[PDB]
Design a protein around this ligand. Sequence first.
Ligand SMILES: OC[C@H]1O[C@@](CO)(O[C@H]2O[C@H](CO)[C@@H](O)[C@H](O)[C@H]2O)[C@@H](O)[C@@H]1O
Ligand SMILES: OC[C@H]1O[C@@](CO)(O[C@H]2O[C@H](CO)[C@@H](O)[C@H](O)[C@H]2O)[C@@H](O)[C@@H]1O
Ligand SMILES: OC[C@H]1O[C@@](CO)(O[C@H]2O[C@H](CO)[C@@H](O)[C@H](O)[C@H]2O)[C@@H](O)[C@@H]1O
Ligand SMILES: OC[C@H]1O[C@@](CO)(O[C@H]2O[C@H](CO)[C@@H](O)[C@H](O)[C@H]2O)[C@@H](O)[C@@H]1O
Ligand SMILES: OC[C@H]1O[C@@](CO)(O[C@H]2O[C@H](CO)[C@@H](O)[C@H](O)[C@H]2O)[C@@H](O)[C@@H]1O
Ligand SMILES: OC[C@H]1O[C@@](CO)(O[C@H]2O[C@H](CO)[C@@H](O)[C@H](O)[C@H]2O)[C@@H](O)[C@@H]1O
Ligand SMILES: O=N[O-]
Ligand SMILES: O=N[O-]
Ligand SMILES: O=N[O-]
Ligand SMILES: O=N[O-]
Ligand SMILES: O=N[O-]
Ligand SMILES: O=N[O-]
Ligand SMILES: O=N[O-]
Ligand SMILES: O=N[O-]
Ligand SMILES: O=N[O-]
Ligand SMILES: [Cu+2]
Ligand SMILES: [Cu+2]
Ligand SMILES: [Cu+2]
Ligand SMILES: [Cu+2]
Ligand SMILES: [Cu+2]
Ligand SMILES: [Cu+2]
Lengths: 341, 341, 341
Amino acid sequence: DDLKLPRQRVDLVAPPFVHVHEQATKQGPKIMEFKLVVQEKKMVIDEKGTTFQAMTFNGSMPGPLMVVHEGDYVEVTLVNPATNTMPHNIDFHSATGALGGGALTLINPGEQVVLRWKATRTGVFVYHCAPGGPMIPWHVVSGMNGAVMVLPRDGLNDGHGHSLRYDRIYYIGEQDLYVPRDEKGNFKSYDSPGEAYSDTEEVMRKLTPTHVVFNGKAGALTGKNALNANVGENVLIVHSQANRDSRPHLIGGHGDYVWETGKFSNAPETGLETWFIRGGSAGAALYKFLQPGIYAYVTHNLIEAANLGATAHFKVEGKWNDDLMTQVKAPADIPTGSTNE
Amino acid sequence: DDLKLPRQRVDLVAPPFVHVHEQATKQGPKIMEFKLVVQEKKMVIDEKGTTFQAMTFNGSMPGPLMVVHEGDYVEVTLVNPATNTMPHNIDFHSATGALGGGALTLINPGEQVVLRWKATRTGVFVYHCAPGGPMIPWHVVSGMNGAVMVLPRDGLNDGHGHSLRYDRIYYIGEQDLYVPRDEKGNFKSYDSPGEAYSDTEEVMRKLTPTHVVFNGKAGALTGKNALNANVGENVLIVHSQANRDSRPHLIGGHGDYVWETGKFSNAPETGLETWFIRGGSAGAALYKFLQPGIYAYVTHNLIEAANLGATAHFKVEGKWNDDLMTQVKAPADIPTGSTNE
Amino acid sequence: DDLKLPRQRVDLVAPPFVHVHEQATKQGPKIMEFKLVVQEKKMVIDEKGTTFQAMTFNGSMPGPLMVVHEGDYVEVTLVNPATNTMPHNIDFHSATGALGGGALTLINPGEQVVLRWKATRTGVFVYHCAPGGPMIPWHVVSGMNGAVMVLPRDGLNDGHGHSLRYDRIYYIGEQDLYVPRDEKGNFKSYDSPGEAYSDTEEVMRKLTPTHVVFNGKAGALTGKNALNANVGENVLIVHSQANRDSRPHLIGGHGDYVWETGKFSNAPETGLETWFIRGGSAGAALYKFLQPGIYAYVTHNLIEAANLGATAHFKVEGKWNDDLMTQVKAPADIPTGSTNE
Ligand SMILES: OC[C@H]1O[C@@](CO)(O[C@H]2O[C@H](CO)[C@@H](O)[C@H](O)[C@H]2O)[C@@H](O)[C@@H]1O
Ligand SMILES: OC[C@H]1O[C@@](CO)(O[C@H]2O[C@H](CO)[C@@H](O)[C@H](O)[C@H]2O)[C@@H](O)[C@@H]1O
Ligand SMILES: OC[C@H]1O[C@@](CO)(O[C@H]2O[C@H](CO)[C@@H](O)[C@H](O)[C@H]2O)[C@@H](O)[C@@H]1O
Ligand SMILES: OC[C@H]1O[C@@](CO)(O[C@H]2O[C@H](CO)[C@@H](O)[C@H](O)[C@H]2O)[C@@H](O)[C@@H]1O
Ligand SMILES: OC[C@H]1O[C@@](CO)(O[C@H]2O[C@H](CO)[C@@H](O)[C@H](O)[C@H]2O)[C@@H](O)[C@@H]1O
Ligand SMILES: OC[C@H]1O[C@@](CO)(O[C@H]2O[C@H](CO)[C@@H](O)[C@H](O)[C@H]2O)[C@@H](O)[C@@H]1O
Ligand SMILES: O=N[O-]
Ligand SMILES: O=N[O-]
Ligand SMILES: O=N[O-]
Ligand SMILES: O=N[O-]
Ligand SMILES: O=N[O-]
Ligand SMILES: O=N[O-]
Ligand SMILES: O=N[O-]
Ligand SMILES: O=N[O-]
Ligand SMILES: O=N[O-]
Ligand SMILES: [Cu+2]
Ligand SMILES: [Cu+2]
Ligand SMILES: [Cu+2]
Ligand SMILES: [Cu+2]
Ligand SMILES: [Cu+2]
Ligand SMILES: [Cu+2]
């Protein structure tokens, strides 16, 4: 027991929600204990019921958000149950050495491993499976990726000596999928990940996804699963993309404070319309809602947003501010005395 | 008449030019009144005369640049003449609430609507049509997008307490187009936007444009329509892309001061070779010309620039500075006594 | 002899190595003399032995890194031997005027030209061939691109008044290639660049590369050609992409200080997981190695990294730090008393 710090078990929750945590803390460094269980399973990924052979951490795309503070030690039990067919591992972009932990965590079905890494760098970071060679992109685009957030011990700041505090936090994991089609253009179904591999690799090689989804399926965060907020609330939106660039945009809002490279040692940019998550990274945006109603959160490639599945909804409760925006005149017939050339 | 401010009618001009405005102002907030008229029409988009079914604000791709100051109110009359076939609306990324105004501006052919928004955020911002669902990307990539610039009341600054002033301003709207081809690879023609839709949506789904153009067509800002400047002039180039990333580059120049995320609350970067406009955003670059001659302004995917139409020209008048650059020896035969391995 | 400064001949070396230079200097401005010789040749670009008709500066993809200091004059002899078949030229993104020098350097086979430019802007910059029209993207994606680094005379700093010094420097040139295939999907071979052109242009038009390589071929910087470093060394990695965006990531490390737009007048960002090189630019990242072992340097589109060739290796010598990372429990059978749902 060389490392004599208090230990604290964390129970992960399914995205887009985030386990209980403190923003600012005066506790010393702890050993934060997390468990991730690999689950290979068929999942539905679009509103027409298209299925595909997914591989996940904890049964979700993305994998759950892990939240720790700078100077904590993160002790991760990775479990690969004997119902799975492939070896798996985990690479933390937040960690230093051994390919992020990938070189120390390769496990066959029936095995588990315990990795500890010190959280020396603040920000939001991708974690993903990375077995070796062509298996790396295949496991990642099959759904084996998540994020970890390392907060400063004093919580967030605006980079100019003022504290920032969120009222609410959501984790939006964006996934690019490569689903094979038959000669007529219909999506193909398979009975195992292994059977899907050869056809999937051919789609992957052309670098155009068939689907781009938040929280694992088209429409996952719309309708009854819309994200909730209130006028006046400061909401932190963590966005990750393990493989492909994304350009997040809150329709009818802004990013008040945006870390687009996702690292809290850098001052955020202010008042962004659209921001940029580079493939293999996580970013974060803080917005204070000023108007009630429906907001669409999209990647602002609008083809991907509207036609390939990458749209989420916020439903915001509160009172409308007619000073910020108003309909002066409702739709009406163009006046007869109008000239419109 | 709850809002008791002076009103000022603005006459928009066709890009790449920009309506008359002040950089710094000591006038108080005004209500700035703008009119936009939707026009569906067939347009030529390449040097071989390829046509396509365009939908525009004010008959231009992009739509015109609107210029206001922080704290102004922007009162927009959107008109959809009864010669058009579809409903249209407008979403301002500069505005707060109701999906940027899209939720308050949906109009059938024969109708108009008046929206007012307060310009609370500085920078350059995209505006675009967004009717609903798959119609959103289709109207945007059919040409229904423009930009608005909200200046600080004191005009631009370098983020370190020094004022920046432009001698000239150009608005470069970049458009990704998806023109269907027949089995032999020739571009198809249609008699209406509706007839084009199904074939166009199939091209859009593969996320590779057939054309990438500035000011609505290949070669629009070359030859006689080259942009003019003089040695010593500080030129502001506003660049927008409503749907797809762009990487602007002034060949033979630099970006002296670049807001690549396009928001004037952030200090510009200095001395850039190439900058990055994320899809769904506008950016701005200031350059002071130091040499006369021809400059190519490109997206630095050179395939898109040279082969898909995304090249503009500046013709700069003045005297050559042999200290910055000189041809020491004109092309000449390789000397006989040379070794070149 | 209007310009009366000392002259210094520089001998270029093949990437990923960099010719001898000083970081900080108290010497005055010099005329730094460089020679580049164009070589058209067939080259192997993947581990299955696929060939393609390359065009290079000095026989390498990328062309060699040129290192000068702010205020130096750069005098470049470009040579196009009569064994070549096409005209060539050179465009320096670091230079001011005449399309970066392209308008002053067009040479037929059998000819040479001498261009001088003043290094007024600090950073790393792309140089590339740019003959005219569709020849521009074709020569660049055929391999005619490199980089130049203009150091501040005081060397690098962290943008907050502290000097940064590298122990080692590597230049990673990333190349997107467009190799035509036959009806069965096999790569086609040609006897000249001219014969390859028409088929290559068709692949280029679809904006999806067949290969994405560092230092001119898949696996070039793996195995015995891995890059060397030691625990504690500050390593500068210069990354260029003349045509297409890249998202560099050091697997198991970070970017301690990153200039992603590549310009030393801007303070670097700190502690990045993944950074972004916009097509037509060079960037630079400083990392201090903290752990020994193998590191993969990738573009974090993992399909491109693992399947299209864009992976390099660092082999780092030193002692493992179990405080930063440790395997707490080696792979072992899942305990019988475990529940993993
Ligand atoms: O800011 C650059 C800086 O990062 C350093 C801190 O000096 O290290 C990072 O990772 C180290 C891991 O032990 C920690 O010292 C530090 O907490 C963290 O930011 C250096 O390698 C470098 O100067
Ligand atoms: O996309 C090609 C072609 O395939 C069809 C079916 O023959 O539709 C498939 O692809 C659509 C777009 O991805 C999906 O909406 C659908 O689930 C799938 O069957 C054609 O409609 C289409 O042109
Ligand atoms: O800088 C973050 C900041 O943006 C704020 C200003 O405090 O609001 C922006 O939009 C508001 C709209 O009413 C204005 O107060 C302000 O002018 C504008 O920059 C906050 O929501 C937040 O602190
Ligand atoms: O692009 C496929 C194929 O189509 C042809 C005509 O059969 O040319 C078409 O596409 C070209 C590239 O977009 C255009 O230059 C031209 O306007 C259009 O007819 C072939 O030339 C080409 O290989
Ligand atoms: O920082 C903006 C600044 O760039 C300037 C310097 O004032 O010029 C750049 O290129 C010039 C070439 O002669 C040099 O004066 C200078 O060294 C370099 O940074 C201006 O054009 C502008 O203010
Ligand atoms: O990629 C299409 C198709 O072509 C084949 C050969 O018929 O393989 C070629 O393409 C592969 C991927 O680029 C290369 O690995 C190989 O060098 C080349 O022959 C098929 O394997 C493939 O499905
Ligand atoms: O030690 N108090 O949180
Ligand atoms: O399966 N994803 O939330
Ligand atoms: O471990 N990969 O299939
Ligand atoms: O009030 N003067 O501009
Ligand atoms: O039609 N565009 O300028
Ligand atoms: O309103 N859309 O076609
Ligand atoms: O002048 N001394 O380096
Ligand atoms: O040929 N490239 O190093
Ligand atoms: O000079 N171009 O082939
Ligand atoms: Cu896996
Ligand atoms: Cu990774
Ligand atoms: Cu419309
Ligand atoms: Cu939008
Ligand atoms: Cu050339
Ligand atoms: Cu260039």
